[PDB]
């Protein structure tokens, strides 16, 4: 009742905490691979940094669910998503939060892109039009939002609107369509993706 939900049954906070706890149990199987993948994009992070980075993707990849529309659709089977895609809104917050925490535009981009693509099956179109389709019904985050982020990541999205998210996502989808990297970009995003699920 009245909680920011991941699923009808589950609060998003509880769901995130379960994914994080589970990350601790497997991370040492994945950390080296992720570190060296980042290193093939000339991004240099030690093992503990890579861990923090992964925890943020874990915590934020479904933050888009705190959209009022998403929350409505979970509680009520009269309200429908209407093409709304939470991950685009997740990608937006992930990017700004990564940029703050690590001060590396490429890392924040790659993290946000992973989050923007966390629903495509592993080893994974991007027109401005489609962005507009997938954000059409976006009508802001829930009221508790700022507090929710604090609970999740420990600070304030105050300290760092719909059309702003549209602009960001379009700008993202483009710079991602354009890379020759493709086979590699798919492998790096593909690499960060596995641990998420
Ligand atoms: Ca998701
Ligand atoms: Ca998942």
UniProtKB/Swiss-Prot annotation:
PROSITE patterns: HD_CAS3. Residues 5-197 form the HD Cas3-type domain. CDD domains: Cas3''_I. InterPro entries: CRISPR-assoc_Cas3_HD (IPR006483), CRISPR-assoc_Cas3_HD_sf (IPR038257). It comes from the Archaea. Its cofactor is Mg(2+). One of its GO terms (molecular function) is metal ion binding. It is an enzyme of class 3 (hydrolase). GO terms for biological process: defense response to virus. Changing residue 86 to A: Very little ssDNA exonuclease activity. Optimum pH is 7-9, varying somewhat depending on the substrate. Its EC number is 3.1.-.-. ssDNase activity requires Mg(2+), ssRNase activity does not require cations. A second loosely associated metal ion is visible in the crystal structure. Proteins of this family have an N-terminal nuclease domain and a C-terminal helicase/ATPase domain. In some CRISPR/Cas systems the domains are swapped, in others they are encoded separately. Belongs to the CRISPR-associated nuclease Cas3-HD family. CRISPR (clustered regularly interspaced short palindromic repeat), is an adaptive immune system that provides protection against mobile genetic elements (viruses, transposable elements and conjugative plasmids). CRISPR clusters contain sequences complementary to antecedent mobile elements and target invading nucleic acids. CRISPR clusters are transcribed and processed into CRISPR RNA (crRNA). Cas3 plus Cascade participate in CRISPR interference, the third stage of CRISPR immunity. Monomer. This is CRISPR-associated endonuclease Cas3-HD.
């Amino acid at each position: 009742i009245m909680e920011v939900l991941a699923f009808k049954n589950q609060s998003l906070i509880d769901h995130v905490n379960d994914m994080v706890k589970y990350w601790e149990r497997i991370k040492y199987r994945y950390l080296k691979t992720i570190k060296r993948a980042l290193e093939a994009l000339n991004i240099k992070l030690d093992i503990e940094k890579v861990d923090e980075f992964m925890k943020i993707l874990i915590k934020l990849h479904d933050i888009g669910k705190a959209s009022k529309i998403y929350q409505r659709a979970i509680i009520n089977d009269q309200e429908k998503l209407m093409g709304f895609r939470h991950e685009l809104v997740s990608a937006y917050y992930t990017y700004h939060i990564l940029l703050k925490k690590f001060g590396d535009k490429n890392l924040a981009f790659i993290g946000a892109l992973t989050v923007m693509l966390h629903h495509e099956p592993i080893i994974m179109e991007l027109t401005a039009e489609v962005v507009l389709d997938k954000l059409k019904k976006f009508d802001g985050m829930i009221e508790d939002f700022e507090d929710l982020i604090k609970k999740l990541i420990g600070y304030s999205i105050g300290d760092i609107n719909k059309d702003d998210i549209i602009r960001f996502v379009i700008e993202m989808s483009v710079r991602a369509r354009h890379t020759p990297n493709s086979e590699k970009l798919r492998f790096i995003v593909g690499t960060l993706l596995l641990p998420l699920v």
